[PDB]
Amino acid sequence: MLVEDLLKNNYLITPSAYYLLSDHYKKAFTLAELIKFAKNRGTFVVDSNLAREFLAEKGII
Amino acid sequence: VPKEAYIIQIDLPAVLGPDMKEYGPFMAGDMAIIPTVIGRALVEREAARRVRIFL
Amino acid sequence: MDKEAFLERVREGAELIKMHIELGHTIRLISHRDADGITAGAILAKAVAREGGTFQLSIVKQVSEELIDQLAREKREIYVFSDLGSGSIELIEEKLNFATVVVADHHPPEKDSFSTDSHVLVNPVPFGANSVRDLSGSGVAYFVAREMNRKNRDMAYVAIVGAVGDMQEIDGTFHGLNLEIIEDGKELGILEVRKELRLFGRESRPLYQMLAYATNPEIPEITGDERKAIEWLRAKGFDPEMKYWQLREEEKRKLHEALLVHMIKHGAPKEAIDRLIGDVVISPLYPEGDVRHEAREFATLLNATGRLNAGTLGVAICLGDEEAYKVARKMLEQIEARKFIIQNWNMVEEGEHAYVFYAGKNIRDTLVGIAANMAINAGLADPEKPVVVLADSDEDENLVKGSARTTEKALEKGYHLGEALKEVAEKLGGEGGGHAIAAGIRFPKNRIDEFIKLFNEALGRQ
């Protein structure tokens, strides 16, 4: 349900990025953690590149 | 799923909507009918403008 | 023309679009950058929305392999091309055979239809229509949208805007299938055809700028000389700061009679004189004085948005969006065209009988005729030597366009710029020719040096 939650704060996500993050949402990272990671990269789009870099910085394997 | 017309002002990959449908990808300058949730977010990011179509 | 055979293609293309709309598929629209394509894009975009469908419209400079490859990777269900694609039928067959394709165009196609299935070419040329006068790209879009839903007849004025932008009425009147669109707009009361001065600027330009910038037709000794235009309008009893629409009907007749006499005195061609007063398409949907109130002025605004990578902003205007119109006007030349040719008149190539000034991209190909007249009326060139301004064609990167202008006194040395330009046109590969004092030519960019030597040798031989 991160599509609606990211949209609530004006964040878009690609379908491939949803594939890599949906199962981990609310279990291994918070919406605020993902939003902060995206904002520090100066983007409001969550793509597969940002998703893989996000899971890497968080230590989610 | 309410939809409106917007001029997407940046390049943009395909993104998911609330209905789990795919929307895009968009070339900078495209005009598309997309769900208002996505369009309003792009408007707030100053990445799109609404366009009214009087029918 | 085989109108019934053409209408069968129109229904085919319309039925395919509506079938995908009822299947829930996003209609992917690709349209051309100029006024004809911007109006054509807005016609099809509104037609899809009117059926409850979804579109994604792209306004492009041209159809290329790189563009088709991007569209193919999008993996759409139906691609709709308007005002382009006729010359890319086999490219589209190859890279988009996985999807429905509809091409709505008026340019001469390389094939009279598609060989692949679910691909329909909606083009009147293979059925006997004249490409440049019987129907424009926006007109084909209008026919297809009208077949989708007769309520789309409310876009008849938008279609004529594109038709005027495509110079379908270059001879002062409409022809072919354009007349069917004009009658539709009259029935709905959204357009009216006036018999008035056909020069650009009847809504937003002062009368002296309307005369000084006249190109179709040109007005001798006045085109390109704002000072002579102000002087001429004062002597004839007109406020040069007044707008054409502000004149009473008797004042307009006074202007027409005065301009026509001035053109007969100064040896204007009969073709130019016959085209001065003719069809001017007006729309009651907009206030008089608004740029959108007149088709040529409207088409001029759209071409402006297209040159600033803001084509869809112009599409939004055609759809009735008032904010986009406000944004476009705040976002938006002849004064810089005179400043350039004056401050760069060291780049000319004067021969034994003519000047040749190649401006490159610094001057639009449409302002080339005015620029040549400005070189005469600004103390830059000997009036006894004709002037030729050249500029890169904005539609073809490998071609160049030019106009040849001279004065009346210089005509009395044996010069004829039409026969001179018709000779070099058939010696370099391209169009060319015109009248005695004004003529144009379009030839390859890689042979500019050969043009200067041949044109001077041709002029000196006269």
Q: What are the sequence ranges of the domains in chain A?
A: 1-61
CB C91 within 8 A of CB C343: no
Q: What is the distance between the alpha carbons of residues C153 and A41, in angstroms, rounded to a whole number?
A: 49
What b/e string do you get for C255-292 counting C-beta neighbours within 10 Å, with b at 16 or more? Answer: beebbeebbeeeebbeebeebbbbbbbbbeebeeebbb
Two structure tokens written together for B21: 């449908």
Q: Largest Cα–Cα distance of chain B, in whole Å?
A: 30
Exposure string over B42-53, b if 16+ CB within 10 A, otherwise e:
bbebebbbbbeb
Those residues whose C-beta lies under 8 Å from the C-beta of residue C139, and which sit 6 or more positions away, are C106, C159, C162, C163, C168, C177, C178, C181
Chains A and B touch (3+ CB pairs under 8 A): yes
State the Cα–Cα distance between residues C180 and C297, nearest whole angstrom: 22
Rounded to whole angstroms, the Cα distance separating C246 from C255 reads: 13
Nearest CA in chain C to B7: C312
Residue C379 corresponds to which tokens in the numbers above?
């103390």
Rounded Cα gap, residues C462 and C104, in angstroms = 47
Window 365-424 of C: residues touching B by CB (8 A cutoff) are none
Report the residue from B17, B18, B45 with minimal CB separation from A10: B45
Residues C377 and C229 sit within 8 Å (Cβ to Cβ): no
To the nearest whole angstrom, how far is the Cα of B17 from the nearest Cα of chain C? 15
Strand stretches in B1-55, DSSP E? 3-8, 15-16, 22-23, 31-35, 48-51
Q: Specify the residue for token string 């969006």.
A: C321
DSSP one-letter code for B34: E
Residue C116: CB atoms within 10 A of its CB come to 15
Mutation target to probe the B interface, by most B beta carbons within 10 A, among C25, C28, C319, C323 is C319
3-state secondary structure C273-312: HHCCEEEEEECCCCCCCCHHHEHHHHHHHHHHHHHCCCHH
Task: Say if residues C30 and C83 touch (Cβ distance below 8 Å).
Answer: no
Nearest Cα of chain B lies from the Cα of C304 at a distance, in angstroms, of 15
Q: Answer whether C31's CB lies under 8 Å from C84's CB.
A: yes
> What angle is formed at CA C404 by the lines to CA C398 and CA C408, rounded to 5 degrees?
175
Q: Which two tokens stand for residue A26?
A: 């609310």
**Residue C164, Cβ density class (10 Å: 0-12 exposed, 13-18 middle, ≥19 buried):** buried
Q: Check if the beta carbon of residue B50 is closer than 8 Å to that of residue B43.
A: yes
Asked if residue C155 lies in contact with residue C242, where contact means CB atoms within 8 angstroms, the answer is: no
CA distance C100 to C81: 11
d(CA C386, CA C349) in angstroms, rounded, equals 12
Distance separating alpha carbons of residues A38 and C35, to the nearest angstrom: 40
In contact, C57 and B32? CB cutoff 8 Å: yes
Buried b / exposed e along C134-157 (16+ C-beta atoms within 10 A): bbbbbbbbbbbbbbbeeebbbbbb
What is the rounded CA–CA span in Å between residue C45 and residue C53?
A: 9
Helix (H) or strand (E) holding A4: helix A2-8
Tell me the C-alpha distance between B33 and B42, whole Å.
13
Q: Where are the domains of chain B?
A: 1-55
Both tokens assigned to B11: 């390049």
Compute the distance between CA of residue C277 and CA of residue C282 in angstroms, rounded to an integer. 15
Q: Do chain C and chain B touch with ≥3 beta carbon pairs under 8 Å?
A: yes
- Assign B45 to helix, strand or coil: coil
d(CA A5, CA A14): 14
Given a contact cutoff of 8 angstroms between Cβ atoms, the answer to whether C418 and C400 are in contact is no
| C window 317-346, beta carbon within 8 A of B | 319-324, 327
Mind telling me how many Å the CA of B30 is from chain A's nearest CA? 17
Nearest CA in chain B to C48: B33
Q: Provide the residue type at C382 as one letter.
A: D
| β-bridge mates for residue C400, sequence order | C392, C443
For residue A21, the cross-strand partners are none
Ranges assigned E (strand) in A1-61: 12-13, 45-46
What does the alpha-carbon distance between residue C304 and residue C66 come to, in Å, rounded to a whole number? 25
The CA-based angle C178-C84-C368, given to 5 degrees, is 80
C163 touches C141 (CB < 8 A)? no
Cα(B53)–Cα(C312) distance, integer angstroms: 13
Residues of chain B numbered 4-33 and touching chain A (CB < 8 Å): 12-18, 20, 22
**Alpha-carbon distance B2 to nearest alpha carbon in chain C (angstroms):** 12
Query: Which tokens hold the place of C419?
Result: 């026969």
d(CA C307, CA A35): 38
Contact criterion met (CB < 8 Å) for B29 and C310: yes
| Coil, helix or strand at residue A40 | helix
Query: How far is the C-alpha of C437 from the C-alpha of C287, rounded, in Å?
Result: 39
Chain B residue closest to C152 (CA)? B55
Give CA–CA dist C317/C39, Å, rounded: 9
Enclosing H/E stretch for B19: none
- The residue type at B45: R
On whether the CB atoms of residues C59 and C32 are closer than 8 A, the answer is yes
Q: Which amino acid is at C457?
A: E
Map chain C to HEC letters.
CCHHHHHHHHHHHHHHHHHHHHCCCCEEEEEECCHHHHHHHHHHHHHHHHCCCCEEEEEECCCCHHHHHHHHHCCCCEEEEECCCHHHHHHHHHHCCCCEEEEECCCCCCCCCCCCCCEEEECCHHHCCCCCCCCCHHHHHHHHHHHHCHHHHHHHHHHHHHHHHCCCCCCCCCCCCHHHHHHHHHHHCCCEEEEEECCCCCCCCEHHHHHHCCCCCCCCCCCCCHHHHHHHHHHCCCCCCCEHHHCCHHHHHHHHHHHHHHHHHCCCCHHHHHCCEEEEEECCCCCCCCHHHEHHHHHHHHHHHHHCCCHHHHHHHHCCCHHHHHHHHHHCCHHHHHHHHHHCCCCCCCCCCCEEEECCCCCCCCCHHHHHHHHHCCCCCCCCCCEEEEEECCCCCCEEEEEEECCHHHHCCCCCHHHHHHHHHHHHCCCEEECCCEEEEEEEHHHHHHHHHHHHHHHHCC
Angle at C16 between CA C11 and CA C21, to 5 degrees: 125
End-to-end CA distance of chain B: 19
Resolution for this PDB entry, in angstroms: 2.5
At B39, is the secondary structure helix, strand, or coil? helix
Residue type, B38: I
Residues C425, B43: Cα–Cα separation, whole Å? 52
Continuous segment of H or E residues that includes residue A53: helix A48-57
Task: Name the residue facing B52 among C309, C312, C320 (closest C-beta).
Answer: C320
